[PDB]
């Protein structure tokens, strides 16, 4: 029934690495905390050699970070892209702290209509 479709697909490079590429084809709506007064989600692209560091330190990059809220969204040959849930008022502190550890926070100011539009994929 649901067969007769190509599940093993040959895909070509259309973008650069995870640190610079567009993320609309990578992220799903469920990766983001929507409609919250205090909570939001930041995406961090982390170089593979620093994957271990991020995992055991992201919870202290800033105050008010939701513990054990990180997950792997995607990976390429150079980077691993994480998402992290935290308080909006601590995002600036977080992104700055992340840059210092040579991580790369991916700016992605999603709204409810910019994520409901993402369900069209």
């Amino acid at each position: 029934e649901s067969g007769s479709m190509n599940l093993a697909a040959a895909e070509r490079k259309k973008t650069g690495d995870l640190s610079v590429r567009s993320l609309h084809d990578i992220v799903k709506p469920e990766d983001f905390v929507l409609n919250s007064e205090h909570l939001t989600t930041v995406l961090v692209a982390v170089p593979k050699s620093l994957k271990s560091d991020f995992e055991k330190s992201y919870e202290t990059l800033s105050k008010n970070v939701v513990p054990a809220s990180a997950s792997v969204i995607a990976e390429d040959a150079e980077y691993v892209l994480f998402n992290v849930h935290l308080f909006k008022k601590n995002v600036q502190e977080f992104t700055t702290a992340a840059r210092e550890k040579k991580f790369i926070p991916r700016e992605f100011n999603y709204s409810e209509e910019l994520i409901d539009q993402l369900k069209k994929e």
Partner: protein
């Protein structure tokens, strides 16, 4: 092993509880401020609503009050005048009863012919001496003409003794009698030309006496 963390399940709950504690605390404080400002606004607004209307009520009260403060002293003024009027009109009702009895007494004298005759004579003589004319006309009550006729001589005698300088030829008793209701006694003497008359009736004399006596009596009785 699917959760990415560097904390024990206890550690994450200690931190998770710490955050949701802050959220609630932030809400309690926010709510506290809301109801504290509401209490202040309650007082402010209650006072204002009241003062709006009390200023209205005060206004028409003072107008109604002034209105009633005026009617209150209009009666005090009207009563105090009715009082001074009753007093004055009572002083007069009494004096006009003194003179009223006086003129009943005068009628009483006229009905005593033995007491009235000498009076009538002196009244007729006094009148003729104010005229001093050769002929005089005498008007009297119809009930006196018989009496007067029977004393013409004595009258013309007494007149001659008091007025020799202006003799009296004849006394004419007029058939136009004096009114019973206006006159109780006395005579009205006039000349032939009817230019001059002396009203020497009892009622007329008393009326002239009133002119000076009435204020005098009023002064001595109610000074």
């Amino acid at each position: 092993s699917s959760a990415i963390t560097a904390l024990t399940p206890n550690q994450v709950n200690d931190e998770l509880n710490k955050m949701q504690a802050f959220i609630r605390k932030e809400a309690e404080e926010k709510a506290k401020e809301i109801q504290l400002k509401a209490d202040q606004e309650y007082e402010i607004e209650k006072t204002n609503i009241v003062r709006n209307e009390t200023n209205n009520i005060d206004g028409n009260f003072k107008s109604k009050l002034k209105k009633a403060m005026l009617s209150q002293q209009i009666t005090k003024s009207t009563i105090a005048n009715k009082m001074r009027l009753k007093v004055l009109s009572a002083r007069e009702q009494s004096l006009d009863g003194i003179f009223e009895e006086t003129k009943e007494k005068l009628s009483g004298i006229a009905n005593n012919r033995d007491e009235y005759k000498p009076i009538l004579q002196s009244l007729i003589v006094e009148a003729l001496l104010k005229l001093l004319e050769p002929k005089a006309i005498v008007k009297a009550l119809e009930r006196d003409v018989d009496l007067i006729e029977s004393m013409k001589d004595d009258i013309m005698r007494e007149y001659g003794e008091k007025a020799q300088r202006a003799p009296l030829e004849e006394i004419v008793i007029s058939n136009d009698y004096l009114n019973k209701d206006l006159v109780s006694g006395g005579v009205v003497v006039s000349n032939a030309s009817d230019k001059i008359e002396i009203n020497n009736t009892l009622e007329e004399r008393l009326k002239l006496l009133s002119e000076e006596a009435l204020p005098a009596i009023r002064l001595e009785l109610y000074g």
